[PDB]
Amino acid sequence: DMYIERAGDITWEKDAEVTGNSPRLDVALDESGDFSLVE
Amino acid sequence: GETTDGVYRVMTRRLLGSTQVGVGVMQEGVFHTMWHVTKGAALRSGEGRLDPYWGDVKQDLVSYCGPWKLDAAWDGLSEVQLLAVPPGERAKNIQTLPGIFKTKDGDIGAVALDYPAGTSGSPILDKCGRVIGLYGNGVVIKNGSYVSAITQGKRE
Numbered sequence: 013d014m015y016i017e018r019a020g021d022i023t024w025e026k027d028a029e030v031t032g033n034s035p036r037l038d039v040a041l042d043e044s045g046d047f048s049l050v051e
Numbered sequence: 052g053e054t055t056d057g058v059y060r061v062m063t064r065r066l067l068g069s070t071q072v073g074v075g076v077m078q079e080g081v082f083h084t085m086w087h088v089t090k091g092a093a094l095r096s097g098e099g100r101l102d103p104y105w106g107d108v109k110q111d112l113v114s115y116c117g118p119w120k121l122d123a124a125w126d127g128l129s130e131v132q133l134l135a136v137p138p139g140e141r142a143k144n145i146q147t148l149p150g151i152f153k154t155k156d157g158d159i160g161a162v163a164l165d166y167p168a169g170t171s172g173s174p175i176l177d178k179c180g181r182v183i184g185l186y187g188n189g190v191v192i193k194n195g196s197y198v199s200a201i202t203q204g205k206r207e
């Protein structure tokens with residue numbers, strides 16, 4: 013049996029750690045909601 | 052139960068100790084998460100009970116107490132923020148410029164940030180603080196690193 017606990021407000025924060033890249037990927041989505049890499 | 056707007060952890064005790072299985076957003080009295088987190092199961096907020104209202108396994112989304120409320124969209128240009136809520140750790144904004152999922156049915160925003168599976172449901176924001184979708188349905192690329200869709204539902 014699952015329960016929920018508050019964790020924070022939803023706010024844009026200035027000078028958050030900036031990171032990750034921006035990859036453009038060819039993907040397929042099956043009927044089970046699973047993404048896959050087309051190649 | 053607590054119905055204050057904001058972000059929440061999704062916990063279970065059915066396992067060893069208390070385990071964070073995911074995350075969600077409360078807005079306009081509706082709770083928003085990903086289907087693979089709850090599998091459409093009822094939830095508890097203190098003593099209050101939340102019942103599923105809408106859900107789609109293929110979108111991998113589910114709403115509780117009412118219809119899907121979040122309708123903001125990535126503009127296709129700007130940096131965004133993942134409000135990561137990882138298991139056992141405090142909420143944390145990470146700023147990123149999303150990449151792209153190209154599919155036969157159109158293009159989706161994607162964020163290249165690897166966090167634990169229990170972070171599934173953490174919201175992605177624009178600079179106005181509006182939620183443009185949820186983190187945690189994605190793919191493992193050649194390297195071995197994880198990339199998530201920006202998953203957004205329809206508001207009716």
Ligand SMILES: Cc1cc(CO)c2cccc(NC(=O)C3CCNCC3)c2n1
Binds near residue numbers: 167168
């Ligand atoms: C293997 C892996 C690794 C990581 C982080 O390293 C994940 C992080 C969040 C969510 C995950 N799961 C999904 O995206 C599934 C895909 C199939 N549809 C249901 C959700 C992850 N899966």
